[PDB]
Ligand binder design. Structure first.
Ligand SMILES: [Zn+2]
Lengths: 139, 577, 544, 195
């Protein structure tokens, strides 16, 4: 009960440190926000379903966000780069449980979002190259 | 080959960094820092396997160049560059240990300034702050470079040429550049001591420095003068006081022509006005070892000449403010009189009181009929405080311009001031702003009391009239000072041998209280609280007192025990300051 | 004659003016030994104590001047023959009373000179014009400082004066007001009686303990609290001084440990502060009698509590702590509220009480005074963040002995309480150094004792949640991450112990009793059993 | 130096013992010899400086001839090596002298032991001079008055176990106030001077 509410703070605080989201100087040299990443990655080992589900919503929110400007585009590109990089580490970090009961998340929550990047994505010549490279490893 | 080649690389790269500024200079330093780390381990293993470790001329010729490039980066505007440079001193110190394990033989001989270098590490391990705050700590350590060194004596010169050329360009042109110049100026001052020792670059630096206090440049002249005063006064090395005062006095000395006639000039007026703040700031700051340097120079001649120029400046709202500060400057000069050196204290103090009495005119703002001139109240109020300090313990001595009996001359001299104070005392009467008169009245009453104490015999008769004064408050103060005179002895009379010895007999007992298990709380507590400046006085009193009480062993055991236990290097600390 | 018509304060009494005017006469007569001190000194102090720091600023400075002149007359009296040794003490005393320390004690702080305020120049042309009716408060501790300074002066003189009766006369005057109901003078007449009395009888003690029962009774029954909230503190303070004079073999020497505890439960800074002072000397006094040499504090205090255990059991139920289940943990929850006392001087007093108790339990078990065991674990948790030797002698294993040893702490209860202490100490504490040390020891407990850890979620839930959202300290945030990971790691299993496990065996109020002092100072309303408890103690231990 | 053990002043004898006790106490909590450190330190800092530059110390009015001075400088190095029991390393210039120092290792130790053998408490050694020391007292009173507030703060931090009424902190305020403010310092005819 109480730990369930604790997890949301870890997940919620991650969103508030996305470049697209106002920085607010909460990074504390990025050590504090990076420590949050480590705890979230470790938690996925026992709460893989919960951690994965939260990440999908964050990616969907970032994907379904309209912002214009060089800084805005860079923030979204860097924002998704961390999300994709964070997601891949959790998948790789997870032991070889071989639990094949994640079809629900894969079919709807995860595949459509990753499939968007796999397209040519000619909007950004340099950003799409990195996102596809990161997404391909996850796939 | 490793030292032959690795060292040869260091000499090439270090010379390039000093040659000119580059965009990636902050990056070479971080990489160059790692190069030192990667060659210390090789020496450690090399010495362990085979001491045999060679130091060819390139190793010495390149070890110096490493220092010559670490100092010049201490004043670098980039915060990271200076922070990295401070951390880079660890590798320089640690290298000494590997070459020679015994500290004293080589660590304190090959690297005389070893102890200060260790301090840089602690400062680096601190929260980041603006360059101004960081420069204070950096310049503090730069002022503690006791031992001259080839790197020190060459880093000072190398940046001196760079600083000089930068200064000319700014003035020649009829903001970022200035900020670097400020850092170079402050850096070039804190480390002056190493370059000390006729014509010398250090002396030429002062001459240009003194020639910048009066720098009148329409574009940035104000900022230059605003900053040279702030830094030179508050940051100069105490080892440069004997040279600053001599140059400062000589500059003033030529302001007066033959026959002692002032030559008023706006630049000379600005020069004296700046000299007041610098001297006040210089005297205001109390640091370790500053007292030792103040004794060498004689400040009497400069002070006497200074008042004459200000004395003839005239009367005006501006001139009153200058006179007010001068009165405050002399007040600060009387708190370090023990530290200062005086050839004839009596002859100098008497003249200063004579020169100051001219300015203390009461009720002169009412005659002027202008409230704008209320500053004269402060100037008179400030003047009294200066005279009070001057009069504290000063016997009167009349100038021998006329030949008369000394006793008569002194009595006339005493009544000259006694009347002056009484006249001002009447004006301060409430019946005739309350804080101004109340504060001024207190000072004027205190001034007379000090005058009587110095010479009771020649002034006792003139003061009897105060017993029946019109102000009840004044009468009380006179009786108190009079009461002390009775308690004092006219002669030795064995009065202190009996009264003071018994009166102060208990004093030693409290100080010499044998705390249980040798705690000695008074001695231990007194040691830390006492400022470092007076440690010389404290040491003699403690040693002398305990020896008389046959308890010296207890004090030594307690005092040494804390030092030895606190630092395992008992011997090193004892030789240290 | 004020007893006939008792008043809440002297200034409100009808005869106030009569006393005030009579004070001015005594002030003038003090100078130049116009008041015969050599025969009236006992009666001068008796009245000075009732006037110190009472009345308008003019009247308050008058009392200070009166004392200054009474001492001077003694030093300049020819009828008495004081040796040169004694006269030195008096001369030093005269200087001491002129220090700024005594200005605050008399209530004349911020006054440069008392004489100037005491006298007014234009006293013939116009009458005095009192004003600034706002009047500072007085603390009975200040009276002790003055009350004992004078007693030093009196004792020195009596050494020279043969067969002097000054002390006997002064005691008699106090004894009359000590055992008489007067809400305006009785509080002042009790703080001085104990400071000067040299002997006590069984009947006297019973009155002191039986006046407290009525003082507590008045507070709850009526709406006037502050009036009766100072008679309680005076009763304890008086007893705090009479224990060192009690018989070496009196039962009350041990029964005065429960009275102090019952006073700390009233949630008042003054009452709580006074209780600790009684406890501190109670332990020291018992040490001189060598009563814990062969027994433990629990054995002694619980042995004397047995005859009236039935009444005590009811009180323990309401407070939410039990001493039969665990004496050393119920005796430390009451001592954890001291950390919340505004005065920095009471925090140090409770720390001394902790050290003294720790050295006694270990000495009973001969465990080196710093070993970790079941009995001496409660006293070490409190001292972990304030005692360096405790931290050094008991260090976390994952950096001598290491705290949290599971070899001896193999009981869920003995280890559940130690977690309750740790959670409580962080719930209200606000310090980076203290929180860091406490959290580092909490992570190790999570893994070493996973089963009992989930009973501490509610206590740490709010603070951790707030810290996690906004904290930006890597040093303090790293231990938090380990705790959260351990919780999820040890999750997925049904809680063997729920959060309410402490309520099962009585200790449901351990966290509540250590909270901050309530601003709305009010009687907890369960003191009605303390009155019954005290009554049983008197009948059982004071037959007559 | 070894022969003149008796001529050592009593004051220094107490000072040397304190270092010996400090080193012995330091070693206990931690083959270093306490006497060796004391002997090396005392000789290097007390005896050695006078030998190197007697003129600076004022022993000789006229500066010794440079040739004589060189012998004194080299003498100090040889003598210091004896105290430290260190042979000549990469010092072939002076290596032949290493033989002489070997015999004198024992002699140096005896001199250090004599001073270091003084009783920790001078119960036997007594000198009831009890001089008034009026001049020194005057400085002490002035210093205490100047730091009356600051010295109190240090006492305030500690001593909570027992009330300060009977302890220096209470006594200092009472006694110091009784004495009153110190008198003004007298003027100095001589120029500024230091120890
Ligand atoms: Zn001279």
């Amino acid at each position: 009960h109480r730990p369930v509410e604790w997890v949301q703070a870890v997940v919620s605080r991650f969103d508030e440190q996305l470049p697209i989201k106002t920085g607010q100087q909460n990074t504390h040299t990025k050590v504090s926000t990076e420590h949050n990443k480590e705890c979230l990655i470790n938690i996925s080992k026992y709460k893989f379903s919960l951690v994965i589900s939260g990440l999908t919503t964050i990616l969907k929110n970032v994907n379904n966000m309209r912002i214009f400007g060089e800084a805005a585009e860079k923030n979204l590109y860097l924002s998704q780069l961390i999300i994709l990089d964070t997601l891949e580490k959790c998948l790789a970090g997870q032991p070889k449980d071989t639990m094949r009961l994640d079809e629900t998340m894969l079919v709807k929550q995860l595949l459509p979002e990753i499939c968007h990047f796999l397209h040519t994505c000619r909007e950004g010549n340099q950003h799409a190259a990195e996102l596809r490279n990161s997404a391909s490893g996850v796939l | 080959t490793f030292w032959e080649i690795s060292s040869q690389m260091l000499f090439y790269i270090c010379k390039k960094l000093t040659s000119h500024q580059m965009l990636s200079s902050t990056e070479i330093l971080k990489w160059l820092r790692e190069i030192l780390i990667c060659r210390n381990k090789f020496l450690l293993k090399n010495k362990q396997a085979d001491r045999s470790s060679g130091t060819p001329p390139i190793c010495r010729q390149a070890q110096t160049k490493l220092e010559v490039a670490l100092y010049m980066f201490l004043w670098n505007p980039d915060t990271e560059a200076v922070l990295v440079a401070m951390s880079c001193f660890r590798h320089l110190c640690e290298e000494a240990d590997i070459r020679c394990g015994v500290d004293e033989v080589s660590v304190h001989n090959l690297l005389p300034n070893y102890n200060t270098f260790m301090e840089f590490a602690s400062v680096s391990n601190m929260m980041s702050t603006g360059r101004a705050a960081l420069q204070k700590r950096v310049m503090a350590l730069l002022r503690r470079i006791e031992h001259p060194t080839a790197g020190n004596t060459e880093a000072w010169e190398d940046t001196h040429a760079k600083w000089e050329q930068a200064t000319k360009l700014i003035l020649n042109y009829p903001t970022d550049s200035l900020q670097e110049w400020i850092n170079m100026t402050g850096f070039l001052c804190a480390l002056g001591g190493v370059c000390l020792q006729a014509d010398t670059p250090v002396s030429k630096f002062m001459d240009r420095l003194l020639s910048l206090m009066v720098c009148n440049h329409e574009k940035v002249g104000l900022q230059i003068r605003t900053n040279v005063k702030d830094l030179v006064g508050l940051e100069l090395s105490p080892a440069l006081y004997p040279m600053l005062f001599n140059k400062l006095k000589n500059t003033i000395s030529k302001f007066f022509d033959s026959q002692g006639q002032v030559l008023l000039t706006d630049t000379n007026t600005q020069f004296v006005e700046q000299t007041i703040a610098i001297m006040k700031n210089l005297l205001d700051n109390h640091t370790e070892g500053s007292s030792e340097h103040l004794g060498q120079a004689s400040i009497e001649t400069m002070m006497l000449n200074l008042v004459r120029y200000v004395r003839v400046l005239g009367n005006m709202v501006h001139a009153i403010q200058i006179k007010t500060k001068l009165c405050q400057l002399v007040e600060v000069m009387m708190a370090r009189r023990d530290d200062l050196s005086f050839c004839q204290e009596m002859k100098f103090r008497n003249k200063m009181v004579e020169y100051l009495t001219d300015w203390v005119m009461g009720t002169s703002n009412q005659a002027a009929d202008d409230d704008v001139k209320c500053l004269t109240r402060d100037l008179d109020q400030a003047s009294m405080e200066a005279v009070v300090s001057l009069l504290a313990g000063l016997p009167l001595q009349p100038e021998e311009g006329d030949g008369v009996e000394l006793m008569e001359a002194k009595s006339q001299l005493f009544l000259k001031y006694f009347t002056l104070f009484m006249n001002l005392l009447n004006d301060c009467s409430e019946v005739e702003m309350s804080r101004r008169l109340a504060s001024l009245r207190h000072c004027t009453v205190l001034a007379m009391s000090n005058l009587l104490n110095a010479n009771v015999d020649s002034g006792l008769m003139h003061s009897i009239g105060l017993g029946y004064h019109k102000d009840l408050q004044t009468r009380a103060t006179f009786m108190e000072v009079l009461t002390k005179i009775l308690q004092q002895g006219t002669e030795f009379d064995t009065l202190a041998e009996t009264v003071l010895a018994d009166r102060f007999e208990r004093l030693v007992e409290l100080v010499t209280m044998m705390g249980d298990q040798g705690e000695l709380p008074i001695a231990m507590a007194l040691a830390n609280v006492v400022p470092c400046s007076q440690w010389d006085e404290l040491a003699r009193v403690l040693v002398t007192l305990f020896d008389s009480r046959h308890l010296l062993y207890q004090l030594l055991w307690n005092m040494f025990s804390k030092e030895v236990e606190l630092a395992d290097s008992m011997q090193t600390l004892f030789r240290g300051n | 004659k004020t007893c006939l018509s008792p008043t809440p304060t002297l200034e409100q009494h009808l005869m106030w003016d009569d006393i005030a005017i009579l004070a001015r006469y005594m002030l003038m007569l003090s100078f130049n030994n116009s008041l015969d001190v050599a025969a009236h000194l006992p009666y001068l102090f008796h009245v000075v104590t009732f006037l110190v720091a009472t009345g308008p600023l003019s009247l308050r400075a008058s009392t200070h001047g009166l004392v200054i002149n009474i001492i001077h007359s003694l030093c300049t009296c020819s009828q008495l023959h004081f040796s040169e040794e004694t006269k030195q003490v008096l001369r030093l005393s005269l200087t001491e009373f002129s220090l700024p320390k005594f200005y605050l004690l008399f209530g004349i702080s911020k006054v440069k000179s008392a004489a100037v305020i005491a006298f007014r120049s234009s006293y013939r042309d116009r009458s005095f014009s009192p004003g600034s009716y706002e009047r500072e408060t007085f603390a009975l501790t200040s009276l002790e400082t003055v009350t004992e300074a004078l007693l030093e002066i009196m004792e020195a003189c009596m050494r020279d004066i043969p067969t002097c009766k000054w002390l006997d006369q002064w005691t008699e005057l106090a004894q009359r007001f000590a055992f008489q109901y007067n809400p305006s003078l009785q509080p002042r007449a009790l703080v001085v009686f104990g400071c000067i009395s040299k002997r006590v009888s069984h009947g006297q003690i019973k009155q002191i303990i039986r006046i407290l029962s009525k003082a507590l009774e008045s507070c709850l029954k009526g709406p006037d609290t502050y009036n009766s909230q100072v008679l309680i503190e005076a009763t304890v303070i008086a007893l705090t001084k009479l224990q060192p004079l009690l018989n070496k073999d009196s039962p009350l020497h041990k029964a005065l440990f429960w009275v102090a505890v019952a006073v700390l439960q009233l949630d008042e800074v003054n009452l709580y502060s006074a209780g600790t002072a009684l406890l501190e000397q109670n332990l020291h006094t018992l040490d001189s009698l060598r009563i814990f040499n062969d027994k433990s504090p629990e054995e002694v205090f619980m042995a004397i509590r047995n005859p009236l255990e039935w009444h005590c059991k009811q009180m323990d139920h309401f407070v939410g702590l039990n001493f039969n289940s665990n004496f050393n943990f119920a005796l430390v929850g009451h001592l954890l509220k001291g950390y919340r006392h505004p005065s920095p001087a009471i925090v140090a007093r409770t720390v001394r009480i902790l050290h003294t108790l720790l050295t006694l339990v270990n000495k009973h078990r001969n465990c080196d005074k710093f070993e970790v065991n079941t009995q001496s674990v409660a006293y070490l948790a409190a001292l972990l963040t304030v005692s360096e030797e405790v931290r050094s002698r008991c260090s976390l294993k994952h950096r001598s002995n290491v705290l949290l040893d599971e070899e001896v702490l193999t009981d869920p209860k003995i280890q559940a309480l130690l977690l309750t202490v740790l959670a409580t100490l962080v719930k209200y504490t606000t310090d980076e150094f203290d929180q860091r040390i406490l959290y580092e020891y909490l992570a190790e407990a999570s893994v070493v004792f996973p089963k009992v850890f989930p009973v501490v979620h509610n206590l740490l839930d709010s603070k951790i949640n707030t810290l996690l959202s906004l904290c930006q300290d890597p040093n303090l945030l790293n231990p938090i991450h380990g705790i959260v990971q351990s919780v999820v790691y040890h999750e997925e299993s049904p809680p063997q112990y729920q959060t309410s496990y402490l309520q099962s065996f009585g200790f449901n109020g351990l966290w509540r009793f250590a909270g901050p002092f309530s601003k709305q100072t009010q009687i907890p309303d369960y003191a009605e059993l303390i009155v019954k408890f005290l009554d049983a103690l008197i009948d059982t231990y004071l037959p007559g | 130096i070894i022969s003149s053990s008796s001529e050592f002043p009593p004051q220094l004898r107490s000072v040397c013992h304190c270092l010996y006790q400090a080193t012995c106490h330091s070693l206990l909590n931690k083959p270093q010899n306490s006497i060796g450190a004391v002997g090396s330190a005392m000789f290097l800092r007390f005896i050695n400086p006078a030998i190197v530059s007697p003129y600076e110390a004022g022993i000789l009015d006229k500066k010794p001839p440079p040739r004589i001075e060189r012998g004194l400088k080299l003498m100090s190095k040889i003598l210091q090596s004896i105290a430290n029991h260190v042979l000549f390393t990469k010092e072939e210039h002076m290596r032949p002298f290493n033989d002489f120092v070997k015999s004198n290792f024992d002699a140096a130790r005896r001199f250090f032991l004599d001073i270091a053998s003084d009783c920790p408490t001078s119960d036997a050694v007594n000198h009831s001079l009890s001089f008034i020391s009026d001049g020194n007292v005057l400085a002490l009173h002035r210093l205490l008055w100047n730091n009356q507030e600051k010295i109190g703060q240090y006492l305030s931090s500690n001593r909570d176990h027992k009330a300060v009424g009977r302890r220096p902190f209470d006594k200092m305020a009472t006694l110091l106030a009784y004495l009153g403010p110190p008198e003004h310092k007298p003027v100095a005819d001589t120029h500024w001077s230091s120890l």
